[PDB]
């Protein structure tokens, strides 16, 4: 308790000595409260005018237009301690899983150079504003690194002074760049060296790309077994127990020297003990603390969520297969059975799963898995939108399974070759491309973000009639040499000024390990669409009068945007489509 968090609390107390009151009407039950102090401040979603002017039919579709307008009583709940049997299953599984992930990888510190290079090409590191303006400036200043140095030596000494969370079914925990650096130095290797690649972790999909996920789910479907299960957890980050954080910390057992000590400090001082500052309109700042739940950087959060989800799903698989009888207590002979199961079939069972942080697909040995709920519920990983003891409903067809906000279609090219393509409701895709985040966007920067969405659509969603047409229109409306941009950056192959037909050939043919015939495609007309009825099912406006008028008059929309941007060099991409080709 206060021996580990006091120093952080003490330091904040003194910087607001004018305002420090132990408020009596504090709304916290599950968070430890410590005091308040005076502040006054808040970043709404802005519309992308280039994308909206080229998607006129969607101006009267509420599912699109409502997306641009506008639970923290789930962060303030508690999770019960798992039973002894459950704690044993988790410890055995976690020990085995770090060893498997460690067989072909070496833990190592990430460098100031790697961190500096990240900041100097806009990765969402979740930092705050203040002594330097931006991340780019602090990183190019020796003073910062001396603050970093002071904290670093405090961590080597087993103590913390400045590693404090700022809070803002979501919740992002920003830290100061320094605390983020020290987290990246100790634990960045999990992402930087691809510990959760499919090659390394067998269940993972880190670095795979949306053009691979469908083929991965089809490969899982080919295993003998029961239905495909895709159960969502209700508020995964809030269900991470102190036992989970201790099993995650066992990655330090594989480390040595300075690295081991720096990593043990991140786990002990920032993950297993947290200090957080939260805005309350009653506007004050509350300084609250707790031991459990997930609150790390978003990239470390991804890897540790993937780890703990892989662990939880192996245990649910063990329950279904009858490897243990009860979570109350593991007998000596059940422990050896669980160890033996892991050694003999553990790697096969990992290959039955696709796991992306809190998101999973499992094809178990049989459907006993559906009603194997005791360990899953006792670990606190309670399923969303189903009663606690109601058996899971599985999917009979891999093309219906939800994963990473998508489903996947099997699409046969006129030449017989097979594409497995990503898909989601088209209102969601159009609504997202019509939104920007943040202030000070020039017309050029707005155009270049629209171009990033257009090129993503050409590469991932070419099979949706409306998106191939809208992508061609946006790429015709934005100057040909202007470079696509994002502000918060899976593999992003559409972020390029290379010709999109050349990129399509590289991604779907040349580098596609599921495509045996490497014959390049010569034009966009060789590249197929979904069935017309399937395209409508997934939200196409094909068949509507609004959509017909838009398609017919598209050159008028393109010319409106070109007139706003001004006298620049543009390319007409519309004749790449049969209907504009004379
Ligand atoms: C006596 N039970 C066991 O040792 C195992 C159960 N399932 C395995 C693959 S090994
Ligand atoms: Zn610290
Ligand atoms: Zn679809």
TrEMBL record:
Domain RdRp catalytic, residue spans: 226-372
Binding site for Zn(2+) 1: 151, 155, 160, 163
Residues annotated as binding Zn(2+) 2: 407, 409, 423, 538
Binding site for Mg(2+) 2: 232, 359
Cell compartment(s), UniProt: Host endoplasmic reticulum membrane; Host mitochondrion; Host nucleus; Secreted
Binding site for CTP: 170, 235-237, 305, 384
UniProt: Mg(2+) 1 binding residues: 232-233, 358
Role according to the record: Regulates the ATPase activity of the NS3 helicase activity. NS4A allows NS3 helicase to conserve energy during unwinding. Plays a role in the inhibition of the host innate immune response. Interacts with host MAVS and thereby prevents the interaction between RIGI and MAVS. In turn, IFN-beta production is impaired. Interacts with host AUP1 which mediates induction of lipophagy in host cells and facilitates production of virus progeny particles. Required cofactor for the serine protease function of NS3. May have membrane-destabilizing activity and form viroporins.
Subunit structure and binding partners: Homodimer; in the endoplasmic reticulum and Golgi. Interacts with protein prM. Interacts with non-structural protein 1. Interacts (via N-terminus) with serine protease NS3.
Protein name, per record: Genome polyprotein
């Amino acid at each position: 308790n206060l021996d580990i968090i006091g120093k952080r609390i003490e330091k904040i107390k003194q910087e607001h000595e004018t305002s420090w009151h132990y408020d009596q009407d504090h709304p916290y039950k599950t968070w430890a409260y410590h005091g308040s102090y005076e502040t006054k401040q808040t970043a709404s979603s802005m519309v992308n005018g280039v994308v909206r002017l080229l998607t006129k039919p969607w101006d009267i579709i509420p599912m699109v237009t409502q997306m641009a307008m506008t639970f923290k009583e789930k962060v303030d709940t508690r999770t019960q301690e798992p039973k002894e049997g459950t704690k044993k299953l988790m410890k055995i599984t976690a020990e085995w899983l770090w060893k498997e992930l460690g067989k072909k990888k070496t833990p190592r510190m990430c460098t100031r150079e790697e961190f500096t290079r990240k900041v100097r090409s806009n990765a969402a590191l979740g930092a705050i504003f203040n002594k330097w303006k931006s991340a780019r400036e602090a990183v190019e200043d020796s003073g910062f690194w001396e603050l970093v140095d002071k904290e670093r030596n405090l961590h080597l000494e087993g103590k913390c002074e400045t590693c404090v969370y700022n809070m803002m079914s979501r919740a992002i925990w920003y830290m100061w760049l320094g605390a983020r650096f020290l987290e990246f130095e100790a634990l960045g290797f999990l992402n930087e060296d691809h510990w959760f690649s499919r090659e390394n972790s067998l269940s993972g999909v880190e670095g795979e790309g949306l053009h691979k996920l469908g083929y991965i789910l089809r490969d899982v479907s080919k295993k003998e077994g029961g239905a495909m299960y895709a159960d969502d957890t209700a508020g995964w980050d809030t269900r991470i127990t102190l036992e989970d954080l201790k099993n995650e910390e066992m990655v330090t057992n594989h480390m040595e020297g300075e690295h081991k000590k720096l990593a043990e400090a991140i786990f002990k001082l920032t993950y297993q003990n947290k200090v957080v500052r939260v805005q309350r309109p009653t506007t004050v700042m509350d300084i609250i603390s707790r031991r459990d739940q997930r609150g790390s950087g978003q990239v470390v959060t991804y890897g540790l969520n993937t780890f703990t989800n892989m662990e939880a799903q192996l245990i649910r698989q063990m329950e279904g297969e009858g490897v243990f009888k009860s979570i109350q207590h593991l007998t000596v002979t059940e422990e050896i059975a669980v160890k033996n199961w892991l050694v003999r079939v553990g790697r096969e069972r990992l290959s039955r799963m696709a796991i992306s942080g809190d998101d999973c697909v499992v094809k178990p040995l049989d459907d006993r898995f559906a009603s194997a709920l005791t360990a899953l519920n006792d670990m606190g990983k309670v399923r969303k939108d189903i009663q606690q003891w109601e058996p899971s409903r599985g999917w009979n067809d891999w093309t219906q399974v939800p994963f990473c906000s998508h489903h996947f279609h099997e699409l046969i090219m006129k030449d017989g070759r097979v594409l497995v393509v990503p898909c989601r409701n088209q209102d969601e895709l159009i609504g997202r491309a019509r939104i920007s985040q943040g202030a000070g966007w020039s017309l050029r920067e707005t155009a270049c973000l629209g171009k990033s969405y257009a090129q993503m659509w050409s590469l991932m969603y070419f099979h949706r009639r409306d998106l191939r047409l809208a992508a061609n229109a946006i790429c015709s409306a934005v100057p040909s040499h202007w470079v696509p941009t994002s502000r918060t950056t899976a593999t992003h192959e559409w972020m390029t000024t290379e010709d999109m037909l050349t990129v399509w050939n590289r991604v779907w043919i040349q580098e596609n390990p599921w495509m045996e015939d490497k014959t390049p495609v010569e034009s966009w007309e060789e590249i197929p669409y979904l069935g017309k009825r399937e395209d409508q099912w997934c939200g196409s406006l094909i068949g509507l009068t609004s959509r017909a008028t838009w398609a017919k008059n598209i050159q008028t929309a393109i010319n409106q945007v070109r007139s706003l941007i001004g006298n620049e060099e543009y390319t007409d991409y519309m004749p790449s489509m049969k209907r504009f080709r004379r």
